[PDB]
């Protein structure tokens, strides 16, 4: 019975902040989206919502899981990387962790 | 300056067969089998006619093209040796001390061995091992003569050079002391 999964988002990875060679700006992050490899493909995802979910120690209001919400703003480079802004900047220990790219604001 | 097309040809007698596979050449004839590996050269083989082999190099540099004639001669010698064979001769040269040579055929390895004694009156004894497939023999037509024969020109020539290079005079004027064993004639077993 129903040997299928339940996935409605696209996978992504947190790479780093916006930076120069020796200066870094945490207010913006760079995200790699799986499967997109050029600027034209990345134009589809402008404006979507991004979620970063993780675990904590204690329960607050019925759970031990927390979220930080954000959105995609503009492309980056020539190879499909994009920029994003979150409500709070990401913790920077998560360089290499995974995020969820929604489809909420559609067409 | 690259050359678009360079080509050479090789005729083949009706008494033998040739096989090429992944640039590995096998020549089969009335006197034995020979093999050669040419996987370090970018060349194209083909069958031009009923009994002619073709060699091609496309878009080659001046340095690259120089190796086309080299490959042709090597394979051609392989055909000649398998159908006629090679034969080198050496001669003893001495002034005062005679040179004594003894030749024995080893049993475990099937090779030939050559021993040299009394070179400029030295007490040490010199020993050289011939390459497999090369046969040595003391001459009976004339004195102080060695005869080396075989199918591979590379094998016969390198073995003959081993004998010549082992006998040297040290700390003397070699324009005056001319003793040694030297190659004097190169030819074929047949004809």
């Amino acid at each position: 019975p129903s040997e299928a999964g339940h996935r409605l988002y696209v996978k992504g990875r947190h790479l780093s902040y916006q930076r120069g060679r020796r200066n870094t700006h945490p207010k913006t992050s760079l995200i790699k989206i799986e499967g997109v490899d050029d600027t034209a493909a990345a134009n589809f995802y402008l404006g979507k919502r991004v979620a970063y979910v993780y675990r904590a120690q204690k329960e607050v209001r019925g759970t031990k899981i927390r979220v930080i919400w954000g959105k995609i703003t503009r492309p980056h480079g020539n190879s499909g990387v994009v920029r994003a802004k979150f409500t709070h900047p990401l913790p920077a220990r998560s360089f290499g962790a995974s995020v969820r790219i929604m489809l909420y604001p559609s067409s | 300056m690259r050359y678009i097309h360079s080509e050479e040809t090789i005729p083949v007698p009706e008494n033998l067969k040739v096989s090429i596979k992944s640039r590995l050449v096998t020549v089969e004839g009335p006197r034995g089998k020979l093999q050669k590996d040419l996987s370090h050269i970018a060349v194209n083989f083909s069958v031009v006619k009923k009994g002619v082999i073709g060699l091609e190099i496309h878009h080659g540099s001046r340095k690259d093209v120089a190796a086309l004639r080299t490959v042709r001669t090597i394979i051609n010698n392989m055909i000649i040796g398998v159908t006629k064979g090679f034969k080198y001769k050496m001669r003893y040269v001495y002034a005062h001390f005679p040179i004594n040579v003894n030749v024995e055929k080893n049993a475990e390895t099937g090779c030939y061995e050559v021993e040299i004694r009394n070179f400029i009156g030295e007490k040490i004894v010199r020993k050289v091992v011939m390459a497999p497939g090369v046969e040595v023999e003391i001459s009976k037509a004339q004195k102080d003569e060695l005869i080396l024969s075989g199918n591979s020109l590379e094998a016969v020539s390198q073995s003959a050079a081993d004998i010549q290079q082992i006998c040297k005079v040290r700390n003397k004027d070699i324009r005056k002391f001319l003793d040694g064993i030297y190659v004097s004639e190169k030819g074929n077993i047949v004809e």
Partner: protein, 173 residues
């Protein structure tokens, strides 16, 4: 699309002792018309006693290739400067337009003789009408009869973003 051939006509300013001065015409290869005019005064300064402050430009026109679909052989005469002394050369090219021939020449001189754009004078560009007028052996092999050749060891084109192939690529395309 880097160069075009222009026609430039110039003149000395008319004076009372010489109304109606003579007119001079040159053919200039340049990326645009602003540097076409600057190149004109450079060459004329070396031949006649005229300057830009004592002359004026009469006309500028673009010369287009008459048959940019026919394969041609070209010959070029030039003069250039090395690190010590100046020399004359003659080279040959095979393409479909005069503009294409000059662009190939500029790349060729930079590669083989380290000559910059600022140290080359073009003397003459001529289309060779007869197949007997070909002199250089690297052109002669291209005008041979019944030409044909294969292409061995061709690397297939693979997207950069696709790392981690699951099979060994071939080179027999």
């Amino acid at each position: 699309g880097r160069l075009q051939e222009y026609q430039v006509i110039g003149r000395h300013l008319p004076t009372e002792a010489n109304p109606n001065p003579a007119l001079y015409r040159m053919r200039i290869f340049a990326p645009n018309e602003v540097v076409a005019k600057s190149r004109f005064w450079y060459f004329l300064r070396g031949l006649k006693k005229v300057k830009k402050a004592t002359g004026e430009i009469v006309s500028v026109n673009v010369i287009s290739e008459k048959h940019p679909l026919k394969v041609k052989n070209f010959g070029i005469w030039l003069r250039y400067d090395s690190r010590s002394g100046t020399h004359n050369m003659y080279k040959e090219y095979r393409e479909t337009s005069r503009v294409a021939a000059v662009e190939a020449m500029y790349a060729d001189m930079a590669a083989r003789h380290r000559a910059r754009f600022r140290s080359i004078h073009i003397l003459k560009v001529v289309e060779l009408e007869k197949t007997e007028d070909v002199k250089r052996p690297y052109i002669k092999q291209l005008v041979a009869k019944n030409l044909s050749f294969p292409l061995p060891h061709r690397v297939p084109k693979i997207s950069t973003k696709k790392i981690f192939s699951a099979k060994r690529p071939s080179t027999f395309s």
